[PDB]
RNA sequence: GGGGCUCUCGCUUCUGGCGCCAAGCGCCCGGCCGCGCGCCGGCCGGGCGCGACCCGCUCCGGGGACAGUGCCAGGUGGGG
RNA sequence: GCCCUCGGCCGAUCGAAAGGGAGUCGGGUUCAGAUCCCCGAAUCCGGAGUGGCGGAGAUGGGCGCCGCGAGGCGUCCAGUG
């Protein structure tokens, strides 16, 4: 509410604890549910990657 | 070769906490229970409705201390009248006095208990 | 031999995004309490800043061998405790009633403690050796002592541990002690100590007085400079032929 | 053969799975039965290390003697 | 009692008789009270340490024997439906 951009709810794995982390990214246009996004230095150049 | 901090947070270590061992009691003696049995039960109710409770519902109606709860009323009636009671209903009157409807056990008759009390 | 085939290795992989990281040591990255961070940053500041020679002179202390010999000598003239003094007083009282009131045993030589006591001994030139702790809480209590001691010609050393000096004087901490007088049999031991002290503290006082401390950068900064100078060294290597 | 030498001093991208509380190895310490010759046979337990490299002085990064703050000086200031 | 290991609602506390929030209904009864009293049918939550009773788990196969058979005994192997 109050924001024109849709938000994306993305779930990662915590690398140090057995747990799931939920982020609230700003949705880039074209991304869909059930899609894999990759965040990091070695991430490839695709829509939605960070 | 075994001191390893596997967490990046420092927490306050748990130190010994001793129980109090006072060198003198702060009060010389424990003050006595003011809400004893004779304080709990003040006087029975002898009104028209109270009389109807005795004959019909096997219930003795009392005016009790406003601080006493149902457990204290139950034990107080049992001790100073030597009767068994089933349940205690309790309201507070508009004038501020607490009123207790003390139903007696089936083998106790509220009529002759009120007779030996002296409120018949 | 009788090895169970059911037994097998389960080698887990700690690559990025693979199996969860093990519980390894994280002391290097702990959020320490404020008092721990404060006393660690204080140590780093004493390395960053240019420490004046009056304060930096106390970072030069006696080595392990010489400090051990010095405290070995000082243990013999350790001051009497309360129970030792009370026993001596009781013995004097019982002796006096029987037939005494004299024989003060010359007040046998003892170690004089305290900065106020020691500085008056140095001014009167009645001190033969002065031992100063290197870690006085306000350094103002001692920064005048090395310069005063040489001005009066009294040999002075800096030892590590104000708690070590305190342990001699049966207290938690002593700022400085002094050998005023020594027994005849220990005169040779004191002379060997004093000569070793003079060559290291009194004789090179002009170097001590002009020796600034600190002014050392951190290992990360030093490494950045080192790889820059190494890169420029290769640049000059190609510059020449 | 292979060192000064450059990236690597890496282990995860076609799937809307799963993933922690160590396997393995080495070194020991208790108790049991016993070859009753000790590294000695086996059985119940407990511990440490490598697995998971070493060292170090700022947690990591970005600014930085500027910004900022305190005091004075000049300007502007119907916002009051 | 102490030691090892594990433990971020990461923030006290207050804030709704219309929000969220387990589980009570029928009949009778008073001058004035009743889903609260009486009668009769339920139901929720909590407790049960020495364990209240049942039922489940869980009670089957193989081999050696006795026994006309039925059925019994010994050994071994299973069995968190
Ligand atoms: Mg009530
Ligand atoms: Mg005006
Ligand atoms: Mg917390
Ligand atoms: Mg509240
Ligand atoms: Mg409500
Ligand atoms: Mg009404």
Whole-angstrom CA distances from A16 to A1, A21, B44 are 34, 11, 72
Q: Which residue of C has its CA nearest to A18?
A: C20
- CA torsion angle for C65, C68, C74, C78 (degrees, to 10)? 180
Structure tokens of B58?
Answer: 């096997």
Asked if C180 contacts C126 with a C-beta cutoff of 8 angstroms, the reply is: yes
The partner residues of C159 in beta bridges, in order of sequence, read C133
Resolution (A): 2.6
Residue B45 DSSP symbol: -
**C61: DSSP letter:** -
Residue whose pair of structure tokens reads 């006082």 in the numeric block: C205
- Residue C121 contacts residue C178 (beta carbons within 8 Å): yes
- HSE at residue B103, side-chain half, CA atoms within 13 A, is 9
Per the CB < 8 A criterion, the answer to whether C56 and C214 are in contact is yes
Give ∠ CA C85-C89-C90 in degrees, rounded to 5. 115
State how beta strands C50-51 and B85-92 pair. Answer: unpaired
Residue nearest to nucleotide E36 (CA to C1'): B89
Structure tokens at B55: 């004959």
Q: Which residue matches tokens 């106790």?
A: B108
Residue pair C214/C46 in contact (Cβ under 8 Å)? The answer is yes
Neighbours of C52 (CB within 10 A): 13
Nearest-by-CA chain B residue for C36: B10
d(C-alpha C178, C-alpha C149), whole Å: 11
Containing C98, the helix (H) or strand (E) segment is: helix C82-99
Decide: residue C212, CB within 10 A, 0-12 exposed, 13-18 middle, 19+ buried: exposed
Which ligand sits nearest to residue B99's alpha carbon?
1
Using left for φ > 0, alpha for ψ between -120 and 50, and beta otherwise, residue C105 falls in left
Q: Which of C16, C19, C20, C21 to substitute to test the interface with A, most A CBs within 10 Å? A: C20
Instruction: Return contacts of C64-70, CB within 8 angstroms, 24+ apart.
Output: C66/C157, C66/C193, C66/C196, C67/C159, C67/C160, C69/C189, C69/C193, C70/C131, C70/C157, C70/C159, C70/C193
Q: Check: CB of residue C118 under 8 Å from CB of residue C127.
A: yes
Structure tokens at C27: 């002391």
- Mutation target among A11, A12, A14, A15 for the C interface, most CBs of C within 10 A: A15
User: What length does chain C have?
Assistant: 241
Protein-proximal nucleotides of chain D (any atom < 7 Å from a CB): 10-16, 19-20, 22-25, 48-49, 51-53, 56-60
DSSP secondary structure code for residue A7 in this structure: B
Count of other CB atoms within 10 angstroms of residue C114: 15
Q: Which two tokens stand for residue C221?
A: 């900064």
Please name the residue ranges forming H helices in C152-218: 162-168, 187-197, 205-209
Long-range contacts of the stretch C60-67 (C-beta < 8 A, 24+): C60/C158, C60/C208, C61/C134, C61/C158, C61/C159, C61/C160, C62/C157, C62/C158, C62/C159, C62/C160, C66/C157, C66/C193, C66/C196, C67/C159, C67/C160
Q: Which residues of C touch A16 (CB under 8 A)?
A: 20-21
Distance CA A48, CA C148 (A): 74
Distance CA B55, CA B69 (A): 25
Name the helix (H) or strand (E) containing C40: helix C34-48
Phi/psi at A7 (nearest 5 deg)? -105, 150
As a whole number of angstroms, the distance between CA C70 and CA C197 comes to 10
d(CA A28, CA A45): 13
Distance linking the first and last C-alpha atoms of chain A? 25
Q: Are the CB atoms for C208 and C53 separated by under 8 Å?
A: yes
Q: How many CB atoms lie within 10 A of CB B68?
A: 22
């Amino acid at each position: 509410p109050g924001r024109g951009a849709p938000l994306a709810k993305v779930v990662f794995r915590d690398p140090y604890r057995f747990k799931k982390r939920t982020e609230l990214f700003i949705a880039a246009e074209g991304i869909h549910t059930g899609q894999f996004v990759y965040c990091g230095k070695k991430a490839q150049l695709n829509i939605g990657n960070v | 070769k075994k001191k390893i901090r596997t967490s990046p947070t420092f927490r306050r270590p748990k130190t010994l906490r001793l129980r109090r061992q006072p060198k003198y009691p702060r009060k010389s003696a424990p003050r006595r229970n003011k809400l004893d049995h004779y304080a709990i039960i003040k006087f029975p109710l002898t009104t028209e409705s109270a009389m109807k409770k005795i004959e019909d519902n096997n219930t003795l109606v009392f005016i009790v201390d406003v601080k006493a709860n149902k457990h204290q009323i139950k034990q107080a009636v049992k001790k100073l009248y030597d009767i068994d009671v089933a349940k205690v209903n309790t309201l507070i009157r508009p004038d501020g006095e607490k009123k207790a409807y003390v139903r007696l056990a089936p083998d106790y008759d509220a009529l002759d208990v009120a007779n030996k009390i002296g409120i018949i | 031999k009788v090895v169970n085939p059911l037994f097998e290795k389960r080698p887990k992989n700690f690559g990025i995004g693979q199996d969860i990281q093990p519980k390894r040591d994280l002391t290097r990255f702990v959020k320490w309490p404020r008092y721990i961070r404060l006393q660690r940053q204080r140590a780093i500041l004493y390395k960053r800043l240019k420490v004046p020679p009056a304060i930096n002179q106390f970072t030069q202390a006696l080595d392990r061998q010489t400090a051990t010999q010095l405290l070995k000598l000082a243990h013999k003239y350790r001051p009497e405790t309360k129970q030792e003094k009370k026993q001596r007083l009781l013995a004097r009282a019982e002796k006096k009633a029987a037939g005494k009131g004299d024989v003060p045993t010359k007040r046998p030589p003892v170690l004089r403690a305290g900065v106020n006591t020691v500085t008056t001994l140095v001014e009167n030139k009645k001190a033969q050796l002065v031992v100063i702790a290197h870690d006085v809480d306000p350094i103002e209590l001692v920064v005048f002592l090395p310069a005063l001691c040489r001005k009066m010609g009294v040999p002075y050393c800096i030892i590590k541990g104000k708690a070590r000096l305190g342990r001699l004087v049966h207290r938690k901490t002593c700022t400085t002690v002094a050998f005023t007088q020594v027994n005849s049999e220990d005169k040779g031991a004191l002379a060997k100590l004093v000569e070793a002290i003079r060559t290291n503290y009194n004789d090179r006082y002009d170097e001590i007085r002009r020796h600034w401390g600190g002014n050392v950068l951190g290992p990360k900064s030093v490494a950045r400079i080192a790889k820059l100078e190494k890169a420029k060294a290769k640049e000059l290597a190609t510059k020449l032929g």
